[PDB]
mmCIF file of C-alpha atoms in Angstrom:
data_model
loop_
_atom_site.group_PDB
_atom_site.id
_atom_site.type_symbol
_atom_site.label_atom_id
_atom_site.label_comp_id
_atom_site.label_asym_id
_atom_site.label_seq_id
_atom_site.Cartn_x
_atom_site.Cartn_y
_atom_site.Cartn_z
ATOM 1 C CA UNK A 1 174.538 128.796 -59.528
ATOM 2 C CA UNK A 2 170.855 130.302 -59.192
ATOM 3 C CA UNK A 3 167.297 129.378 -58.683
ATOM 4 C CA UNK A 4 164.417 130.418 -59.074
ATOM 5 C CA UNK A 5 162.497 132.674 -57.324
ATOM 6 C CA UNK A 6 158.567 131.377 -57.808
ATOM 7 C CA UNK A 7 158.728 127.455 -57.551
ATOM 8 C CA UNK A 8 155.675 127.222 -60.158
ATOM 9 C CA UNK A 9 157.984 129.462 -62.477
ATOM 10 C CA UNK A 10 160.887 126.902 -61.914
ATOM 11 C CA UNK A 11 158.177 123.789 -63.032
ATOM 12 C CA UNK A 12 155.693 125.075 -66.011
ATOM 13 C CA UNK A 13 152.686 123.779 -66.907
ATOM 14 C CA UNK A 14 152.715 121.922 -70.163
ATOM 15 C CA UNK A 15 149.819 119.908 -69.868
ATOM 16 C CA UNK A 16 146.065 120.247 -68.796
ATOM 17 C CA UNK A 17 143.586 117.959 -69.081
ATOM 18 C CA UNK A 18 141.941 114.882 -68.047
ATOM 19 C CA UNK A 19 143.054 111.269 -67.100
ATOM 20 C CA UNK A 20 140.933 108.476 -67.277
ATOM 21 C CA UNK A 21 140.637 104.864 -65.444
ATOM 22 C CA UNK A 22 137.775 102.821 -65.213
ATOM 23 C CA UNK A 23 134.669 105.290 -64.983
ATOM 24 C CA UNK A 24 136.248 107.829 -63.321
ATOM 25 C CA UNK A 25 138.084 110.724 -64.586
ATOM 26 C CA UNK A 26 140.842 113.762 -62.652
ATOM 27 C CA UNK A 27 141.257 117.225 -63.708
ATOM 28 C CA UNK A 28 144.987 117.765 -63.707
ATOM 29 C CA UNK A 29 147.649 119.915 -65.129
ATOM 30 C CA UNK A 30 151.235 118.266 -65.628
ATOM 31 C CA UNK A 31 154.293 120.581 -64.285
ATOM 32 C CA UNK A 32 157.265 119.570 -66.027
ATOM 33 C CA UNK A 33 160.493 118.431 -64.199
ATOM 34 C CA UNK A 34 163.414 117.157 -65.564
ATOM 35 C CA UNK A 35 164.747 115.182 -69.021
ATOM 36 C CA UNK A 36 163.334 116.594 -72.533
ATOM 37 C CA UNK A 37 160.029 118.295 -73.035
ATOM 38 C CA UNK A 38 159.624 117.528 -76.470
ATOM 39 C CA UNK A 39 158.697 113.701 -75.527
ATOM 40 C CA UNK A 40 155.768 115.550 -73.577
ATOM 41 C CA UNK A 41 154.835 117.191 -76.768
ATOM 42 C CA UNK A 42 154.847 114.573 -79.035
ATOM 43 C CA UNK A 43 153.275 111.862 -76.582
ATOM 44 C CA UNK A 44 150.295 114.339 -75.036
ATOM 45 C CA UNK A 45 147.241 114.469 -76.692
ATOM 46 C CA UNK A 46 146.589 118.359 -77.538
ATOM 47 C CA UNK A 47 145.944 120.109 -74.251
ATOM 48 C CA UNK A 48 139.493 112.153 -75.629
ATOM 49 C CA UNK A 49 140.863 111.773 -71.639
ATOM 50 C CA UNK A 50 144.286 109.892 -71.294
ATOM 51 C CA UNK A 51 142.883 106.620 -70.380
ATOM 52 C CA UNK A 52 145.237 104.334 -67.588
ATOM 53 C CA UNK A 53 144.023 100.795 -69.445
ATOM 54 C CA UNK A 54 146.887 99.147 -68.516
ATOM 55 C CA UNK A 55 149.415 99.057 -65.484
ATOM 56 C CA UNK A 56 152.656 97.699 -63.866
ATOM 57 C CA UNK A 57 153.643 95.977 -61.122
ATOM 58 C CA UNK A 58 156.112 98.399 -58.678
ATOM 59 C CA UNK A 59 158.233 95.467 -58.379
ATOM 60 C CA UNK A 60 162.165 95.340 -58.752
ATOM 61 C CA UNK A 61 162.619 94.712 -62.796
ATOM 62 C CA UNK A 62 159.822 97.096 -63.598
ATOM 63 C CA UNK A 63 160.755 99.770 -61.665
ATOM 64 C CA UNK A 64 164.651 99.106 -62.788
ATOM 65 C CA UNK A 65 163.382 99.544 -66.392
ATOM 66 C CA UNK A 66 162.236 102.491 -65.651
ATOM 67 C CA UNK A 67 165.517 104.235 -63.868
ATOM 68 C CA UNK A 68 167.509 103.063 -66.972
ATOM 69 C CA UNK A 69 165.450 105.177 -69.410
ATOM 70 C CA UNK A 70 165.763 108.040 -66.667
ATOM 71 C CA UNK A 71 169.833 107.793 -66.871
ATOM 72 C CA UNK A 72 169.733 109.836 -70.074
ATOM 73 C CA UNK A 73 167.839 113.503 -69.778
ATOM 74 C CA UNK A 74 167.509 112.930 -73.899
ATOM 75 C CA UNK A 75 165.573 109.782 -73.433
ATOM 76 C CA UNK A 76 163.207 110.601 -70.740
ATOM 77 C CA UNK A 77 160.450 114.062 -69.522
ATOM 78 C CA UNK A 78 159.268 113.602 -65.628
ATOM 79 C CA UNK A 79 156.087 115.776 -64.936
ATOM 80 C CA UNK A 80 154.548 116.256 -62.073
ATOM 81 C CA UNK A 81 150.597 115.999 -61.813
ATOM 82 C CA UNK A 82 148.455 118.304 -59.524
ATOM 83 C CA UNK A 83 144.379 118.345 -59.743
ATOM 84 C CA UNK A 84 142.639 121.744 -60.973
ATOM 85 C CA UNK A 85 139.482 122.807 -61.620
ATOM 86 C CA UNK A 86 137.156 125.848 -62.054
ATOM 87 C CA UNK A 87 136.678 126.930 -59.408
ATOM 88 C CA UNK A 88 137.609 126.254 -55.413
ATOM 89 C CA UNK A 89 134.385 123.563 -55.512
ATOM 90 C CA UNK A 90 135.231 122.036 -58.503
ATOM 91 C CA UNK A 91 139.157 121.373 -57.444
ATOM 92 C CA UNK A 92 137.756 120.013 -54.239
ATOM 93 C CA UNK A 93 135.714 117.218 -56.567
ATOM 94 C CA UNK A 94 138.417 117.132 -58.784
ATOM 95 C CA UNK A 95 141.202 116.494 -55.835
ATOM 96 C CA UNK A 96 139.041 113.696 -54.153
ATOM 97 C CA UNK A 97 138.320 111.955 -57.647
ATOM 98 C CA UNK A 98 142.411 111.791 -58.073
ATOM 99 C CA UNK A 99 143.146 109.986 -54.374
ATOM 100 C CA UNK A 100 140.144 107.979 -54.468
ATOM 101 C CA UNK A 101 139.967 106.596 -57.884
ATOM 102 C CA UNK A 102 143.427 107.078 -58.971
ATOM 103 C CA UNK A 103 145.818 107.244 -56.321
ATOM 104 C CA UNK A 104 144.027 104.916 -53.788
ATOM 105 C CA UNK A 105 143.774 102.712 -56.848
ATOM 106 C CA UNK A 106 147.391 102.589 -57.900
ATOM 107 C CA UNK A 107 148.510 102.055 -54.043
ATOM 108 C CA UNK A 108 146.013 99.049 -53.198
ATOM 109 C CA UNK A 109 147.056 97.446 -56.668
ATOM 110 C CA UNK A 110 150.980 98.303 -56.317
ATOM 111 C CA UNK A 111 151.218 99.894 -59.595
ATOM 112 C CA UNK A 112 152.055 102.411 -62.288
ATOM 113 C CA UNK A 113 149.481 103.434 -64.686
ATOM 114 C CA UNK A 114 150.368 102.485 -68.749
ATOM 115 C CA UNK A 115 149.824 104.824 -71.626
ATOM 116 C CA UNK A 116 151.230 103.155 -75.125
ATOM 117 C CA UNK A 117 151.231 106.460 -77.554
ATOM 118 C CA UNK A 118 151.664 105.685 -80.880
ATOM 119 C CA UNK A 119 153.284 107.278 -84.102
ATOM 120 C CA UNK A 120 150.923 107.588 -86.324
ATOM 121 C CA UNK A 121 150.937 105.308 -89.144
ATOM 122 C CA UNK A 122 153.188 102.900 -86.771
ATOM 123 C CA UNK A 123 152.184 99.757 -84.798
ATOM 124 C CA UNK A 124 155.095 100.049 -82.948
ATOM 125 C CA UNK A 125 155.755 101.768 -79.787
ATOM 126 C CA UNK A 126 156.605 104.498 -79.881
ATOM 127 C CA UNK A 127 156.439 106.446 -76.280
ATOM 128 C CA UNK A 128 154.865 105.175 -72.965
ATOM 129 C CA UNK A 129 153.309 106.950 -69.949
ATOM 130 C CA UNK A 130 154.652 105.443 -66.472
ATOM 131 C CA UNK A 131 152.321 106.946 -63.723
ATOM 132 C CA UNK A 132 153.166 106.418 -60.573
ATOM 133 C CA UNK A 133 150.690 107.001 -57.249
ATOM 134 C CA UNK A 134 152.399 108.901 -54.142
ATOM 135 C CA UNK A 135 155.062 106.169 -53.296
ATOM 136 C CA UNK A 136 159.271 104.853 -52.621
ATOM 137 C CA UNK A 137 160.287 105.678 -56.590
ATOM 138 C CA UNK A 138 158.734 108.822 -56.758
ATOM 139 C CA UNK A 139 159.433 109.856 -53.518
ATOM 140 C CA UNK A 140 163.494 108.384 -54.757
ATOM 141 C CA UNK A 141 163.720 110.536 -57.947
ATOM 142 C CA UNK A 142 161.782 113.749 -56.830
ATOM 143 C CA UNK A 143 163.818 113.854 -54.282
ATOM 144 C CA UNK A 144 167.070 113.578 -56.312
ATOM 145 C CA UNK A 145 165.604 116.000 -59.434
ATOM 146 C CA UNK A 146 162.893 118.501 -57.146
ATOM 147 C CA UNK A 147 163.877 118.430 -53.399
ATOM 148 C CA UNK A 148 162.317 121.619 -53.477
ATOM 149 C CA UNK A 149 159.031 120.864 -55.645
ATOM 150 C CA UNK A 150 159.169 117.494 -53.287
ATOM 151 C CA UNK A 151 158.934 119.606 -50.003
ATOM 152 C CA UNK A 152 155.845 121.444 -51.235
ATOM 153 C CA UNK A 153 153.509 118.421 -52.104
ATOM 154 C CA UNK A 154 155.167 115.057 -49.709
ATOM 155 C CA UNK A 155 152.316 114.278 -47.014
ATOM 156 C CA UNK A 156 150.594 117.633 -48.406
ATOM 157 C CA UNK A 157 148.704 117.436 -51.584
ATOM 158 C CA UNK A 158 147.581 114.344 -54.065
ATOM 159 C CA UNK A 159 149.725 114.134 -57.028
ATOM 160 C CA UNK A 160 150.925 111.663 -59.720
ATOM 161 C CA UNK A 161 154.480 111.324 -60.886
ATOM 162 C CA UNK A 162 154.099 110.547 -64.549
ATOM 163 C CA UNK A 163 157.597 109.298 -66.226
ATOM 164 C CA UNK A 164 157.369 109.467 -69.864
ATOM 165 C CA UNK A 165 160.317 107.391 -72.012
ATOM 166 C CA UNK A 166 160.912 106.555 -75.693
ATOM 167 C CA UNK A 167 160.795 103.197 -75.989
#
């Protein structure tokens, strides 16, 4: 029974990059949460944006979809995704593009971004990105998996919860 000393140390970074949606595009680096990393790995690009073309209602079914892929650590990687930039001007730019064309997107629309990632060589899917905006699941699970990492960003800073699942 421990923890860890520096939160950040407790949550790495495995991702950096941008996101895309519409003509807009985020800075962000993805802290990684809970379930299996290797899904991160094989379903982000090397750290092209990730473009959001797609989304999903955050409506009962969808959502429930979602929680069953999450009941098996194996089956599922939860990151957590916090603007960067530069330097302290950049972030700033950087932080506004991700609540105003991202987040405030996502909330007005009631939705979860969509990333299909392929397998190369497959037509199939093969993984899918779930982002979610500041809202009642990712407020649920963070709360259940990061209390701590929860406390640090709720009503504080802009982030994305992006769910990642083998389909």
């Amino acid at each position: 029974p421990v923890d860890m000393v520096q939160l950040l140390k407790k949550y790495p970074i495995v991702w950096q990059g941008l996101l895309a949606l519409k003509n807009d595009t985020a800075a962000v680096q993805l802290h990684f949460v809970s379930g299996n990393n290797v899904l991160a790995h094989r379903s982000l690009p090397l750290s092209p944006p990730l473009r959001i073309a797609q989304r999903m209602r955050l409506e009962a079914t969808q959502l429930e979809g979602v929680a069953r892929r999450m009941t098996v650590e194996t089956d599922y990687c939860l990151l957590l995704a916090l603007p960067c930039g530069r330097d302290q001007e950049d972030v700033v730019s950087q932080t506004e593009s991700l609540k105003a064309a991202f987040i405030t997107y996502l909330q007005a629309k009631q939705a979860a971004g969509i990333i299909n990632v392929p397998n190369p060589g497959s037509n199939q899917p093969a993984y899918v990105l779930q982002i979610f905006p500041p809202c009642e699941f990712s407020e649920s699970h963070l709360s259940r998996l990061a209390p701590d990492l929860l406390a640090s960003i709720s009503n504080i800073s802009p982030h994305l919860m992006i769910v990642i699942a083998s389909v």
